[PDB]
Amino acid sequence: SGFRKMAFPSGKVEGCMVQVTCGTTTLNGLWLDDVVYCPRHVICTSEDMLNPNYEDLLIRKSNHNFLVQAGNVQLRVIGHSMQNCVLKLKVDTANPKTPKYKFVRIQPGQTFSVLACYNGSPSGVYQCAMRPNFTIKGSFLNGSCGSVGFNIDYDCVSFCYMHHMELPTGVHAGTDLEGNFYGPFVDRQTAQAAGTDTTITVNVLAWLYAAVINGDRWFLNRFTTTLNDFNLVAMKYNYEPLTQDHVDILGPLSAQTGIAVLDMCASLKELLQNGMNGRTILGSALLEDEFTPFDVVRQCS
Amino acid sequence: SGFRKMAFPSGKVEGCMVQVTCGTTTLNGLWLDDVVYCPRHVICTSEDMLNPNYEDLLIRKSNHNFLVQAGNVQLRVIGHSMQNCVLKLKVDTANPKTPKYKFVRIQPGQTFSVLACYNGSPSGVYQCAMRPNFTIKGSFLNGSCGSVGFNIDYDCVSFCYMHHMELPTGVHAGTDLEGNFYGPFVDRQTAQAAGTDTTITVNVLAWLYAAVINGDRWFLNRFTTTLNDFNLVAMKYNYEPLTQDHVDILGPLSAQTGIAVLDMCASLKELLQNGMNGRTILGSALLEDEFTPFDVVRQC
Ligand SMILES: CCOC(=O)N1Cc2ccncc2C1
Ligand SMILES: CCOC(=O)N1Cc2ccncc2C1
Numbered sequence: 001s002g003f004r005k006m007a008f009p010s011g012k013v014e015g016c017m018v019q020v021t022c023g024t025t026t027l028n029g030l031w032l033d034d035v036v037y038c039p040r041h042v043i044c045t046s047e048d049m050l051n052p053n054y055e056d057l058l059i060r061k062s063n064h065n066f067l068v069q070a071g072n073v074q075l076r077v078i079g080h081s082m083q084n085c086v087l088k089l090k091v092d093t094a095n096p097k098t099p100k101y102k103f104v105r106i107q108p109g110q111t112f113s114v115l116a117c118y119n120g121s122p123s124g125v126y127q128c129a130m131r132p133n134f135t136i137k138g139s140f141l142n143g144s145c146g147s148v149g150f151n152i153d154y155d156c157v158s159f160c161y162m163h164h165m166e167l168p169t170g171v172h173a174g175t176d177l178e179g180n181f182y183g184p185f186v187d188r189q190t191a192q193a194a195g196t197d198t199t200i201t202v203n204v205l206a207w208l209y210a211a212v213i214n215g216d217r218w219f220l221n222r223f224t225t226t227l228n229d230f231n232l233v234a235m236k237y238n239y240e241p242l243t244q245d246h247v248d249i250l251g252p253l254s255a256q257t258g259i260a261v262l263d264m265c266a267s268l269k270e271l272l273q274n275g276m277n278g279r280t281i282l283g284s285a286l287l288e289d290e291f292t293p294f295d296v297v298r299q300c301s
Numbered sequence: 302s303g304f305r306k307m308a309f310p311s312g313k314v315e316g317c318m319v320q321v322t323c324g325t326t327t328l329n330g331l332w333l334d335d336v337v338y339c340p341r342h343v344i345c346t347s348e349d350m351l352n353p354n355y356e357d358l359l360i361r362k363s364n365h366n367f368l369v370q371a372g373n374v375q376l377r378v379i380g381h382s383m384q385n386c387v388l389k390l391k392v393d394t395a396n397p398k399t400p401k402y403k404f405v406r407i408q409p410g411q412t413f414s415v416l417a418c419y420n421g422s423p424s425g426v427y428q429c430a431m432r433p434n435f436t437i438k439g440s441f442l443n444g445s446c447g448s449v450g451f452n453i454d455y456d457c458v459s460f461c462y463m464h465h466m467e468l469p470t471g472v473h474a475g476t477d478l479e480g481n482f483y484g485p486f487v488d489r490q491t492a493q494a495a496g497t498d499t500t501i502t503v504n505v506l507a508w509l510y511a512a513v514i515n516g517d518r519w520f521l522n523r524f525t526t527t528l529n530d531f532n533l534v535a536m537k538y539n540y541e542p543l544t545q546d547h548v549d550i551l552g553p554l555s556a557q558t559g560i561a562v563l564d565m566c567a568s569l570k571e572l573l574q575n576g577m578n579g580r581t582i583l584g585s586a587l588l589e590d591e592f593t594p595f596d597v598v599r600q601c
């Protein structure tokens with residue numbers, strides 16, 4: 001037993017991380033088959049970042065403008081192109097450590113592991129949720145751009161995130177591996193803020209199931225409720241709506257414990273109104289919303 | 302910016318994890334050079350659970366009784382010995398993925414990454430601290446025995462923990478990689494219980510220094526405290542005593558933020574008295590004790 005925020009083992013991804021330098025900018029690239037993926041903003045001087053014309057800055061560049069280092073080995077760049085906000089540097093050598101992989105775009109509420117990197121060197125791994133406002137609450141310092149997020153399904157790595165920027169509130173924004181931003185953000189030095197975040201209702205309920213499974217039971221009660229009734233409480237507390245699709249996804253946990261979702265929604269309703277009456281749940285004084293149902297089932301079964 | 306419980310990249314440890322089977326018992330082993338390390342309790346049966354005589358049970362085993370398996374490959378055991386509570390299976394192949402490594406015994410308050418593994422396959426990675434009662438608050442299911450805890454400072458892997466057992470309170474106990482238990486625990490299923498646990502005071506102060514570095518100041522106050530007055534208050538909330546050593550270790554974080562250690566001690570005395578009044582520090586509504594002074598500097 002026990003319940004902890006747990007990342008996927010990162011080794012399949014550690015083997016894909018390289019250093020990418022263009023002029024004075026060094027950051028992280030992802031080396032899969034014979035291509036290195038990194039943020040297109042590596043080609044930008046500080047001056048360029050204010051109003052960059054990427055079309056024009058890039059036709060001005062050539063293969064030899066990009067230094068790509070896998071540990072202590074220079075890769076030769078033999079091609080360059082841009083897809084949305086991601087730069088593709090074709091190299092002379094296919095990565096012998098390329099795992100089985102897909103590029104995937106995740107949905108708000110879904111979780112993934114981040115491998116934080118600096119000068120193409122893996123440095124830490126931690127679990128994030130894609131927030132409803134399309135930010136993630138990461139831990140990133142200068143040089144962390146190009147760090148990637150992923151899931152693992154059997155032997156397949158699904159890459160879902162590349163880190164581009166930090167917003168003024170301390171939260172992080174990036175793209176999928178096809179260079180499409182998550183959220184209404186642009187890769188320019190301009191004024192950008194995260195929308196007001198919302199609480200991921202289905203993940204809080206998953207976490208209450210994990211708490212029960214680990215013998216934290218105090219917050220439970222004899223009552224039940226309806227979507228309509230709960231959702232009017234949810235809207236009031238800045239909670240995402242609970243859909244019928246969410247109730248079905250919590251199916252397994254509802255069975256495995258004897259508490260039905262609207263039975264658990266009754267408990268959560270009470271915690272929102274009345275608070276935790278000075279207790280913790282799984283060593284937290286907050287309602288944790290960065291564990292999905294799958295995360296709980298994975299870790300608890 | 303941001304502040305997260307951050308584990309080390311697990312790849313260097315993934316390449317060492319194998320499955321060990323003895324009788325009906327399967328658990329994880331650690332394959333370094335020509336040796337597989339695993340808990341010696343893999344050689345116990347149902348009636349060996351209470352008062353196993355390990356020296357008696359091991360002399361009755363031959364190399365071929367131990368089925369070691371790295372992915373598909375069966376590894377052939379050519380030698381076995383016990384060191385304390387750890388079994389060492391010598392094998393005919395050296396692990397080609399063996400990283401630079403060392404074995405280190407850590408003190409209470411120290412943190413490490415855990416690679417949780419089932420049937421020799423790594424499942425997930427997370428951070429833990431050695432609690433002052435010599436347990437860890439982990440996430441471990443049946444089969445996780447032989448999972449290890451480690452740090453990776455400067456490309457050298459320091460192994461500090463191997464998982465042996467879960468105690469009745471749902472907390473976890475194991476050994477260093479020389480097989481000596483952390484705490485007064487033994488590898489028998491005779492009734493055991495952890496000492497009352499305490500909060501790791503030096504780590505809470507480091508985490509308050511992290512919050513200030515990330516631009517939180519709301520909990521500072523105009524007060525100071527003597528070290529002795531701090532300890533007399535903090536022990537009334539089940540906090541560990543803060544020693545001069547702990548004060549010395551925070552000197553760098555003090556210097557970087559310009560808040561004296563005993564000034565920060567007055568902030569913590571106040572937070573214990575007041576709670577947080579609907580506020581949070583670095584995303585938490587509790588005081589966090591599983592980041593060391595070194596972890597704060599590494600991450601910030
Ligand atoms: C006060 C210093 O902050 C920075 O310059 N950055 C760069 C940067 C880029 C991406 N994520 C986070 C960061 C932190
Ligand atoms: C079926 C055994 O009961 C459990 O749920 N355990 C075993 C066990 C053994 C070692 N560490 C953790 C655990 C969790």
